[PDB]
Design a protein around this ligand. Structure first.
Ligand SMILES: Nc1ncnc2c1ncn2[C@@H]1O[C@H](COP(=O)(O)OP(=O)(O)O)[C@@H](O)[C@H]1O
Ligand SMILES: Nc1ncnc2c1ncn2[C@@H]1O[C@H](COP(=O)(O)OP(=O)(O)O)[C@@H](O)[C@H]1O
Ligand SMILES: Nc1ncnc2c1ncn2[C@@H]1O[C@H](COP(=O)(O)OP(=O)(O)O)[C@@H](O)[C@H]1O
Ligand SMILES: Nc1ncnc2c1ncn2[C@@H]1O[C@H](COP(=O)(O)OP(=O)(O)O)[C@@H](O)[C@H]1O
Ligand SMILES: Nc1ncnc2c1ncn2[C@@H]1O[C@H](COP(=O)(O)OP(=O)(O)O)[C@@H](O)[C@H]1O
Ligand SMILES: Nc1ncnc2c1ncn2[C@@H]1O[C@H](COP(=O)(O)OP(=O)(O)O)[C@@H](O)[C@H]1O
Lengths: 258, 247, 299, 344, 378, 308
C-alpha cells in the first residue's frame, strides 16, 4: 500500500490510541492514558513511537506535515469506541496503575490494559509506600487527634474510615455521608490530606471521572464520593495513601456500598 | 472521467450514506446507523468500504486528502432527505435489528433496510436469548413476587403486561400508565429491570421508546436479564400487541 | 477564454440561484427553493446542472475543487437581491406550487417563477385532489356535526369556513380569530384536520416566520403571514361530542346543542392523513368563495 | 511591475472602493455604495469594474484567486479613511441620488461624489415622479381626508407637512414628534404611505426605546414607534449611545399614540424638544358609522375603504407621496432645517 | 541570506513598526502612529515604505503573499515592548504632532519620536492656526457670550479656561469637573466646540459609568475611554423622583486613577490608561450615595449663566433668577459648528490658554463651595 | 534525516522552551520567561536562538514557513508538563531575577533555572540598587512621615513592614489584610509606591470579589461575604501568591494596620502636590525596592507567616 498508511496501521496494531464515547481520542505516551479535546495529542504519539518502527518507517515521521497525514489516517480508523474505567478497584498514577486487591504497583504496558483516562497527576515513588518512616507515626497521631479511638467514637471512626477509603473506587456511589462539625475541628486538614493522597481525583462539568468532590447519586459519568504548613509541601502523601489502601482492603473487598 | 467520482458513485450505490431532515448525514459502519456533527464519519465509511471496491479503486482510498475529495463528492450528491425510524415493530440492537412479530433476529445487510437510528446500546448474543436458563427461573420468580396471579391481580396483570410490552414499538403511544402504590412494591425494581432489558431506548426523549395530552403527540416513541426479560417482553408482545398497538 | 467563468455565467443564465435581502443564497434543486445559511447549497446545484451543459463543460464539474471556483464566480456575480414570496395567492408543495385562485397545480420550471422558499413539507399527491372520494363525504359529515348548516349557525359556519380558508394566503392577516367553546366540541379536531391539510406551515416570534397558519403587535406585516388562532375554553362551538359513557352525558346542559357519538378511531385516522387531501380540496373550494377579489378578516 | 498591482492601482484610481471610520470597506456597484461585513464585497467590484480596464487587464480577473490578490493589494493601499454622508439634502435610491433643493435625479458618476452608504432599497423611476397622474389625485384626496386644509386646522397641517418632509435629510433632528390621535384615523395609513415612499430609510421599533433597538437605527431617516424622561434627552443628539458604542442620529422620531402622553419628569428642558399634531378625521365602518358622529373627540367622519391598505402595500402610492414630500421639503427646509417645538 | 529578511531588517531599522505593552502592533503610515486590532495594519506599512528601499528591494513588495512573509518576519523580530504616549504635552493630529510648550508644528521623523498612537482625527492646516481671522473674532464673541469677562464671573471664567485647557495634555487628571447649568445655556455648545477642536480624543458615554458596579460583565463604555483626553457623560436626570439611582460615590475615585479597570465585549484586557479629563454635563445638583472628605477632593464645578432663547421665550426667560444674562439664540450656529468652522480658532485659543496656565506643571483644583450638602459638610 | 528536526532538538536541548501544566508554552527570550496564549511565541525564540546554531543551521531560520516547521516539531517534542514558580523567594525583573535570600541579582542562564513567568514589568538598573543615593533619604523621610518610628506605633510599624515586605514571594499567605484609614492618609500613596516597586506583580480589582480572578494568577500582591474571605486565603482559588491588602476562623484570617498621621489623628502634616508626579514616574522605584529587600532579609529569612 502506502508508507504513511502502513505506519498508521502498525501504530494502531499496538493499541496505543483509542476512541471513547465522549468523542475523545485517548493517547498512550509517557506511561499514562492522556487526552485533550482541544488539539491533537496523537501527533505526539506518532513522534514517540518513532523508536518502535523499522528504519524505513522511522525517518518518514520527522516532518510535521507527515505527522498530520498519519494522524488523520489513525483518526479515520477508530470506527468503534472502547469502554473506559471498566475496573473500579484501580488507582491511576502518572507512571502506572495500582491494584487495591493486593497493593502492588504496575508500570508500562502492564498499566495499559487497564484503561484509566484520568490519573492522580503525580508519579508513584517506590521508596515511599513503606510501612514505617518518619512520617507514619505523626500521621497516625494526628488522625487519632482529629478522630479519637474510643468506644463511643468507635462506630464514628469505622464510618469515617469507610468513607475515606471509598475515595478510590471507579464506580459510582449512591449514598451520602455528612461532614457536620463545629468551627475548627480539622475538616480542612482532612480535605488537604485526602487531596495530597489522590490529587487530580478531587475537586458539574469539571467533576468528570473524579472520585471525590438525589441528583448526585445517579450513574451519569461520575464516580465521586459526595461528602497545616507541612501538608502543602506534600509530606503525608504516601503514608495517608497507605492508610487509605489499608482501610479499603479492610472494608471494601466484596461489594462497594455506603 | 474521474476516478474519485466513480468511487463516490459506487459508494452511494450501496445506500450506506443517507441524509436526515436535520441536514445531517447518517452512515452505516459495523452494523449501526451512526451519525455525528463534530467529526463526520463519511470519511470513516470511505476508509471502511475499500474492501468492497475493485483493486484499482481500493488503492486510491488509502489517503487522507484523497478521502476528503470522495467525501465532498458524496456529500454534494445527497440532494434530498430521507426519513428515519419508520418501522415501529423492530428492536435495534448494536449488531442488527430483531423483529417482534416474527421473532427472527436479523444482522448485517438484512438489518440495513430498517433505518433505526437509535440503538438498544448493547450487542445481542444469540446464545443467551433462550427459554431455559438459570436466570430466567429466578426472574419469573421475582416477577411473581412483585405481582402475583391472584384475584385482585388478574386484570391488573393484563394491564401490566400490556404496558410493559408497549415499550418496544416505534409508534406513538395513545395512553399514559401510572404506578400508584406503596414503597417496596416493585416500582423501582421493574424500572431497573426494564432499563436492563431495553437498554439505551430508555430515559428516566428523541426516539426514546420509554420514559419514566402533550406527551401523546407525534419526534417521540416513549410510553410515559437482557435475554430473559427480553424473552418475556417479546412473548407478551406476541400475546397482546399482535394486530394493532393501542393503550 | 475561462471555462470556469463561462460555466458560472451559464448557470446564472438559468436563473437557478438567487440572492436574498437576508443574505442567503436560495437554490433551485428538486423543484424546491431550498436555502441553508450554514453550508452553501450552490455546489450541489453546480453538480446537478451538470447534465445540461456541453460535454466539454460537464467533465470539469466532477472535481470538488473546480466547483468552489464556480461557486466563487457565481457569488461574485450576484449583486441584485431578489425578493422572496411576493405572490400571496399560492400554496407551495414539495413538487411545485398550487394556484388557489384558478385551481391547477404547477410543477417543475413552472413553479420556479413563484419564489416560494417555505413549503408544506409533504408531497402533493395528484390523484388525491378529487371532489369525490371515500373520505371527503365522511370529512364533510365531520364539519356538519361540528358546524351544522342551521339558520342560527349559518353565520358561525361562514366565519369558520372563512377562517379555515384564510390559512392559505401569503399575505399578512389583520384579525385574531377565536375558537371559543366548551370541552369536546371539535376544535382540536379542526386543528388536526388543518395540520394534516397544510402541514409544515403550521406552528403550535422568530420561529413563527413565513408560516401561513399558527395556533395589535401580531397584526402587522413586520415577515408575518400567519393566521393567528387562539383556542379558549370569534367562531363559537356548540355541538359537544360525547362518548358512550357520555351518552348519558347528552341531555341536560345548554352549553351544547347537539351531541354526536364519539368516534375514538377518528383521531387515529387523522395522523394517518386519511382526510388530508379531502381537506385540501375543501379549503381551496372554500377559499375561492370569500377571498377571490381580496383577502381580509373582519374583527 | 506586478500586473495585479497595476490592476489594483487602476481600480483605486477610479475611486470605486472607499474606506470609512468604522472598519467597513464600502464598494460602489450598481450605482450604489454598498457595504457588508460578512463578505469582501470588494471582490465583487473587481469583477464588475472589469469592463473598464484594457483588454490585457481583463481576462485575468476571471479567476477567483486573482481577485483575492487584487483585493489584498487594494486593502493594503487604502491607508486613509473618508468621511461619509456629509450631504444631508440628498435622498439615495438604489439607482441614483435625488437632490432635494432642486429635485433632480442624478445617476452614474454624478451620483457618486455624494457618498450614500444607506439607500431607500428600490429604484427611482423617472416617468412616475410627476404631478399629473390618477394616483396623484387619489393620494391628494387621501391626504385631504386625513388632514384637511381648513382654518382651524392650519398650524397643525403645517406641522404635519414639516414633520413628514423632514424625513428626507441626513441632518440630526433635535425634536420629538407625536401623531397623537384616536384609533383608526390614519396614523398607520401615514406610516404605510411613508414606508412605501422612502423605503429602507424607515424603521419601526418597540416601546423599550421610550421606556439593541438603538443600534439598528443607524443612518435611518425615519423611526416610527407605534402603540422615561431622559430617553428624549438622549434621542435628539447627533451621537446617540448604543451598542449592538456611538451611532449617528440622522433620524426623525415619530411616535404613534392614542391617548395624551404622560412623562416621568416634566421640566422646561423637555418642552423644547416636543411636538404634537392632532388627528381629527375618523374613518369608521358603515355599520358603525352612526356611532362616530355623536362622539366629540373627533371632528369629521368618512367611509373606511378596504382595498386602500392592499394597494398601499403594493407600493402603488409610492412616487406620488415622494413628490409630495419633495414639494413640502422645498418649502420649509431650503435655507436651513430646524424642527420647532410646540409646548402647547 | 534572504532577500525578504533583509527587507524586514531594513524596515525595522527605520523604527516604523513598534510593539506596545497592550500587545498591539502600531505602524507609521502617513505621519500617524495608527493601530488596528482586527487586521495586521503592518502589511500596509510594508507597501508604503516601498519607496524608502533600493530598486531591488521595492519590486518584491508588489506581491501580497510576499508581504505576508515580511509581516511575519517583522512580527518575529519585535521581541521588546514599548510604552507609548509617554510625552503628555503633545497634541497628535492626522498629519503631525503639535507641541504645546511653544506651539511649533512637526512632521515626519520630527513627530515620530513621540509615539502617540491616538490622534485628533483631522489634518492640521498651517494658515488657520493664527490670531487674526473673522472666525477667530466671532469665536471670541461667542465664547465671551458663554462666559462673560466680568469680575463676578472672573473666577468661574478662569477655572473654565483651565478645565478646557487641560483637555490637551496626556497626563492623568485626578479632579472630576462638572458642567452644572440650566437648560439652553451652552454646555452642549462647549461640548460640540471641544468635539470639533480635539475630535477623536473625545468620547460620549451614558450615566451607567456613574451609577453601576463597573466591573460585572462586559462593559465597553470603559474600554473605549482609553487614552482619550476628554470624556463627556451627558444625560444626568434629576434624582428627586422614584427609580433614580444615586451617583455611586466610589466611581469618582475609580475614574481618577492613572489606570481604569473594565472589560470590553469578550476580552481580557481589563487595564486602560486613563488620560481623560472626566467632565460631567449635568443640569441639577448631583447627589451621591455618601458624602465625605475623600470624595470632596475630586470634584470641581463651573456654573453656566448666560441663557439662550428666541424672542418668543425671551420675556419668560428674562425674569428667571436661575440665569444672569440672556442673548439672542442663533439657529445656524449649530450648523456652522458641526461643519468644523470654529475648529482651528478654538484650538489656537486652547493652546494659548494652556501656555498661559499649565506651562510649569499640570494640576487641577476642586471647588466644593457650590453644592448644598457639600456646603453643609463644610 | 531532517535539518529542521535537528534544529528543534538543539533548541530544546538548551531548555529555552518549556511546557507548563496549564497547557501553555513558556519561552526564554531576552532573559525573561514570556508566555502568551494568543499566538505561538516559540517562533520568536527560533529567531532569537539563530545566533547559537551552526552556520548551516542558521540560514534555515530566515524563513517564516521554516520557522513554523521547527515550531511544529518543538510543539510535538514537549510531552512532559513542568511546574512553574516553584521558588517563592525570588523577584523576577524583565532582565533577570533577584535572589531575596542574600540580595544579589542574577541574569541570563543564571536566572533561567528559576522558572518564574510573571516579571515585575521593568528592568533592573545595576547602578541604582544602592543604600545611599540622592533619591533615597527622602524615601525613608516620606515613609517615616506616613508611619513615624514611634514606640507607641512600633508594633504598627513592624506589622506594616512585615506585610509590605511579604509582597515579594511566591508562597501562599493565609490571612487577609486591610489598609483601613481616613482620607488623605497615604494609603493610595503606599499603593502607588508598591506598584512602582513591583509593577506587574500588582493588580487592582473592585469589590465584586469581596474573570476578575483569572488575571490575579501568580501575582504577589493585589488590592481592592465572609465566604469569599474563607476562599481567598487558600493555595488555590489558578495559583494564589497574592498578599491580599485592601467567628474564630474569621478571627485567624484578618490583619489590619491602622494609619494614624493625617496630611493636608495624632499628627497633621503638609501635602506634597508634586509627590504623586514624582511617584508615578518611578523615581523611588529602586530605592523602595532596596528598602523592601532589606526588610525581607531582616524579617522573613527563616520562614514566612503573617500572624493576625
Ligand atoms: N493533631 C493536630 N495537630 C496540630 N494541629 C491540629 C491538629 N488537629 C487540628 N489541628 C488544627 O486545627 C485546625 C482545623 O481548622 P479548620 O478545620 O481548617 O477550620 P475551618 O475549616 O473552619 O477553617 C487546623 O488549622 C490545624 O492546624
Ligand atoms: N421479587 C422482589 N420482590 C420484592 N422486592 C424485591 C424483589 N427483588 C428485589 N427486591 C428488592 O426490594 C426492593 C423493592 O423496592 P421497590 O418496590 O422498587 O420500591 P423502592 O425501590 O422505592 O423501595 C428493591 O430495592 C429490591 O432490591
Ligand atoms: N363527527 C365526528 N367525527 C369523528 N370524531 C368526532 C366527531 N365529533 C367528535 N369527535 C371526537 O370528539 C373529540 C372532541 O374533542 P375536542 O372538541 O377536540 O376537545 P377540545 O375542544 O377540548 O380540544 C375529538 O377527539 C373527536 O375525535
Ligand atoms: N382617505 C381615506 N378614504 C377612505 N379610507 C381610508 C382613508 N384613509 C384611511 N382609510 C382606511 O381607514 C383605515 C384607517 O386605519 P388607521 O387610521 O391606520 O388605524 P390606526 O390609526 O388605529 O392604526 C385604513 O385601513 C384605510 O384603509
Ligand atoms: N452665543 C451663543 N453661544 C452658544 N450657543 C448659543 C448662542 N446663542 C444661542 N445659542 C444656542 O444654544 C444652543 C445650545 O444649548 P443647549 O444645547 O440647549 O445646552 P444644554 O443642552 O446644555 O441645555 C444651540 O442650539 C445654539 O443655537
Ligand atoms: N507624608 C506626606 N507628605 C506629603 N504629602 C503626603 C504625605 N502623605 C500623603 N500625602 C499626600 O496625600 C495624597 C494621598 O492621599 P491618599 O492617602 O491617597 O487619600 P485617599 O486614600 O483618601 O485617596 C498624595 O497626593 C500626597 O501628596
Amino acid at each position: 500500500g502506502n508508507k504513511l498508511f502502513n505506519i498508521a496501521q502498525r501504530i494502531l496494531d499496538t493499541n496505543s490510541v483509542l476512541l471513547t464515547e465522549r468523542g475523545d481520542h485517548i493517547v498512550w505516551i509517557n506511561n499514562s492514558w492522556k487526552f485533550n479535546s482541544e488539539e491533537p495529542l496523537i501527533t505526539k504519539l506518532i513522534l514517540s513511537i518513532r523508536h518502535q518502527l523499522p528504519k524505513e518507517y522511522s525517518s518518514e515521521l520527522l516532518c510535521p506535515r507527515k505527522r498530520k497525514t498519519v494522524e488523520a489516517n489513525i483518526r479515520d480508523m477508530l470506527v468503534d469506541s472502547v469502554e473506559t474505567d471498566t475496573y473500579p478497584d484501580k488507582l491511576p498514577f502518572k507512571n502506572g496503575v495500582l491494584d487495591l486487591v493486593d497493593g502492588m504497583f504496575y508500570s508500562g504496558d502492564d498499566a495499559k490494559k487497564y484503561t484509566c483516562t484520568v490519573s492522580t497527576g503525580f508519579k508513584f515513588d517506590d521508596t515511599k509506600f513503606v510501612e514505617d518512616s518518619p512520617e507514619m507515626e505523626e500521621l497516625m497521631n494526628i488522625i487519632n487527634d482529629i478522630q479519637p479511638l474510643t468506644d463511643e467514637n468507635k462506630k464514628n471512626r469505622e464510618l469515617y474510615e469507610k468513607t475515606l477509603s471509598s475515595c478510590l473506587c471507579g464506580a459510582t456511589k449512591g449514598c451520602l455521608t455528612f461532614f457536620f462539625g463545629e468551627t475548627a475541628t480539622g475538616k480542612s486538614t482532612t480535605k488537604r490530606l485526602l487531596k495530597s493522597a489522590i490529587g487530580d481525583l478531587f475537586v458539574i462539568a469539571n467533576m468528570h471521572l473524579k472520585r471525590s468532590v438525589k441528583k448526585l447519586t445517579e450513574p451519569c459519568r461520575n464516580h465521586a464520593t459526595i461528602i497545616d504548613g507541612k501538608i502543602q509541601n506534600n509530606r503525608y502523601r504516601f503514608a495517608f495513601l497507605y492508610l487509605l489502601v489499608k482501610w479499603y482492603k479492610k472494608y471494601h473487598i466484596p461489594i462497594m456500598k455506603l
